[PDB]
Structure formats: C-alpha cells, structure tokens
C-alpha cells in the first residue's frame, strides 16, 4: 500500500530530531578531555559518552509521545536504554574497514583497544564490534535507523517503568511505521524488519554486560572520580 | 639564635612535599578540558581546581603530624581549607605585570576575566587579585611559602574539627618554625611573620565569599554537571 500522512509526519520529526542532535563533523570532540593511548582513555571516553547522553535526551524529547509521559517514566526509559541508544547511533561512525569508530583524525579514531583502556573487556567489546558490523551490513536508510532508536528507547520492558501500557502503545505505533516504510520504500527488505527487531535483542545482552563492567568501575573511587556527574546519574543505581 | 635539627627536618619535608606536588612547567594542563574565551571557562577551571585538590591532598599527607589525625579531621581540614590552599599555591604562577596566572601559552594564561566565565564575580576576584599582589610583594622564601600552606591547613578553627586541641598543637609547632626561620634566615623580615599571619585572615574572607558563589553555582544542575566528582565532594555540604 502506502504510508499515511500521520506515519509520514512521525518520520519527518524523528529524522529532523536526529539531524539536530548528531554532528557528522564531530567538531565538539575537541572540548572533551584529550584521549591518551590505569585506564588512560577513561577521561576522554567518559566525556564522549556524557556528551552523547545529552544528545540522546534531546533526541528523545522529540520522539512523538515521549514528552507526554511522566518525568519518572522518561527517567526510567533513558536510564535503561541510554547505553543501547549510544551503541546504535555510534554505528554511524563505525567503519567496516578498520573495524573502528572514526570521528576525526588519528586522535578521534577509536579502536577496540582504546575502549579497553577505559576499563572494559573483550567479553563486551567483542559482541559489540560484532553487533556494529552486522548492523552496518543492513545499510539501513536514515529513516529506519532513526526509527530503530525511537523503538529501542520506547521499550516498555524496562525496570522502573510505571505506565508500561502507554509506552507499549507508543512503541507499537513506531513499530508499525518501520514495517510499513520497509515494505513501501525499501526494495529487497523482505527480511529487514525481522533482522532489526533481532538487533534489539543483541542490545539487551550488550547492555547487561555493560552494566556489570560499569558497576565494577563505579565502585572504585579512583576510577569513579573520572566519570561525569551525568554519567554517574544515568548509570547509577541510586533511583 | 638558630634552628634545631627537628625544626629543620620539618622544613626539609614540607619543601620536598611541595616540589613533589607542584609542577613548574604546568605540563598536565593539556589534559584538562580545553579553555574557551554561559560560563564557557567552567569546564577547564573545574578540571584545574580538581587537579589542584589532588595535589593539595598529596602535600597534606606529607605535613608532619597530619597523617596521624583521624580520617574525619583530615577530611574536615581539607574541605574547609582546600580553596585557601589553592589560592596560596596559585600565587607561584601569579604575575605582577599582567595581573594574571601564567601557567603556559596564551591558552593557559588566566586573566581576571576568564575566572568570571567560570561563574564568579568581581566581589571575589577583586579581593583575590589584591591578595595575590600583596602576597607576591612579600617575596617569601620557598621555605616560608610552604610553611604558610601547612599552617593554613592545620587551622583548628574549622567547622567539623573534633580533636581541635591536637590540631592546635601541630599548627603551633609549625608557627614556631616559621617565626624562627624568618628571624634566623630572612634579613629584613622584622614584620614578615605578622604580615603572613595577616594573609591567613584575608583567606578566610575569600574562602567565605567563594563558598557563597560556589553554592549558587552548585544548585544549578546545568552548571553543576560541569564540575568533577572530587570538586563536588570537597565543596559539597553533604558531610
């Protein structure tokens, strides 16, 4: 068939929200504490992630229906999907050639090794890169990529959610648009949608593992003092 | 008369502790979030101060008698004198010519205006610079400068102190050395000591004013999120 004027307006909003919260030049990276190749990359990586949280928030506030939720559910949804949304949007800078995130010169070109110097292990970075590669191979349209992030964020299956019935509705409305768009606008995507919903499941595993490695990291005050107030709040358990 | 072998050992320890916690090249400043001329200098200034707190701590742990105090008194003494110790040690980089702190190229050369872009006002920066100038004019020997910091830090008149009787003793032992040294080793310092004890009083006023301007700053989460975990802990009231 063909998209409706409502589904289409949702797409215009999400794509504009993304454009407004994602700089393809990565020009703000110079304001982060400089990178350094005991966890010498932590200071820079913490600033980069803290920066991203702010962007994910600005993007979220523009997801249709999200801003009507209660402050608490918004907090609950951000806190639990934050790291997953960062992993998804970061794919835009991932390169299948050098298997790394290229956000600028040799300095802002993050290799698997660099993240290790932030306090993480291969037990996470492995499935992560494997996720990036697989996700990249889907050559998602900008419209599908932005929809995937709005769906991941509106997952009602998050610890701390209250109105897990309205959230469930919002996500479905979005899931509808994504499926319609793939059918109407993406030649060869008979199995796409399915492959995308699968990616959400991979994120939960990555999210889980990250929470563990992050927990260990936050209990050590010599490392914890390197994080930012926002990162500590978002990934903290003091809810 | 002449210094004793005990007073002399105190001086060797403090001067060595200072040398070990104060880099005259200011080479670590490149690791701070870059400076930028709503409070654009806050990120850099917060990192610089956070860095300094760590140095003041390392210096303090080496002050004779300090490490025997209770963890609580150490915390209590650091928290209340921190900003004063930073103001004193920063004098080593202050220049009477350009009335500014020169820690490197044009970038790391802090002008009165820059600190304003960190959220502070002339009501503080004025007495501050006036303090720096006056302090600089005393051409203190390295031995007297380091003693002044060890005395300021061991001020028993601090909110939160318990054994305010042992602290009072330690400070006196130090006050003795400073007075002896000026008499025996500093030609023309008949009024020095007195001028130095006076500087401590100026610090209390600067400290007081800073606490206010800092309080206002910490209540605004858009600014508070720019500070570091250590700065928030040291200047926080959550004791």
């Amino acid at each position: 068939h063909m998209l409706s004027d409502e589904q289409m307006q949702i797409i215009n909003s999400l794509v504009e929200a993304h454009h407004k919260t994602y700089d393809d030049s990565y020009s703000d990276f110079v304001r982060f504490r400089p990178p350094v190749r005991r966890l010498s990359m932590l200071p820079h990586l913490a600033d980069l992630v803290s920066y991203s949280i702010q962007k994910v928030i600005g993007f979220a506030k523009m997801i249709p229906g999200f801003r009507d939720l209660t402050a608490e559910d918004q907090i609950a949804l951000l806190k639990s999907s934050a790291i997953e949304i960062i992993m998804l949007r970061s794919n835009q800078s991932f390169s299948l050639e050098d298997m790394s995130w290229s956000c600028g010169g040799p300095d802002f070109k993050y290799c698997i090794n660099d993240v290790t110097k932030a306090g993480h292990t291969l037990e996470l970075l492995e499935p992560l890169v494997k996720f990036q590669v697989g996700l990249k191979k889907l050559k998602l349209h900008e419209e599908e990529h932005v929809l995937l992030m709005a769906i991941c964020l509106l997952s009602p299956d998050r610890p701390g959610v209250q109105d897990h019935v309205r959230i469930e509705a919002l996500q479905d409305r979005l899931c509808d648009v994504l499926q319609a768009y793939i059918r109407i606008q993406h030649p060869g995507g008979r199995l796409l949608y399915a492959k995308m919903i699968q990616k959400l499941a991979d994120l939960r595993s990555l999210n889980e593992e990250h929470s563990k490695q992050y927990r260990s990291l936050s209990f050590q005050p010599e490392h914890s003092m390197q994080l930012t107030p926002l990162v500590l709040e978002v990934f903290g358990s003091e809810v | 008369h002449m210094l004793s072998d005990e007073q002399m050992q105190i001086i060797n320890s403090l001067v060595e502790a200072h040398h070990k916690t104060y880099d005259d090249s200011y080479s670590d400043f490149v690791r701070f979030r870059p400076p930028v001329r709503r409070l654009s200098m806050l990120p850099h200034l917060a990192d610089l101060v956070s860095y300094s707190i760590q140095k003041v701590i390392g210096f303090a742990k080496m002050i004779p008698g300090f490490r025997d105090l209770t963890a609580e008194d150490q915390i209590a003494l650091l928290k209340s004198s921190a900003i004063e110790i930073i103001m004193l040690r920063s004098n080593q980089s202050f220049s009477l010519e350009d009335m500014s702190w020169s820690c490197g190229g044009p970038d790391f050369k802090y002008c009165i205006n820059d600190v304003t872009k960190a959220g502070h006002t002339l009501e503080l920066l004025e007495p501050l610079v006036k303090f720096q100038v006056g302090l600089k004019k005393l051409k203190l020997h390295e031995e007297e400068h380091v003693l002044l910091m060890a005395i300021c830090l061991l001020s028993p008149d601090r909110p939160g102190v318990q054994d305010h009787v042992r602290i009072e003793a330690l400070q006196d032992r130090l006050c003795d050395v400073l007075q002896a040294y000026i008499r025996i080793q500093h030609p023309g310092g008949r009024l020095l000591y007195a001028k130095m004890i006076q500087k401590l009083a100026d610090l209390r006023s600067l400290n007081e004013e800073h606490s206010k301007q800092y309080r206002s700053l910490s209540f605004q989460p858009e600014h508070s999120m720019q500070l570091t975990p250590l700065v928030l802990e040291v200047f926080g009231s959550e004791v």
Binding site: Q54, I57, K61, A71, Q74, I75, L78, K79, P229, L230, E233, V234, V239 | P221, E222, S224, M225
Partner: peptide
C-alpha cells in the same frame, strides 16, 4: 535524585 536528568528533560 536525578537532579540533572530532570533539568535536561524540561
């Protein structure tokens, strides 16, 4: 208390 998240979400 999520002091910062509230501020950013407003």
């Amino acid at each position: 208390r999520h002091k910062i998240l509230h501020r950013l979400l407003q």
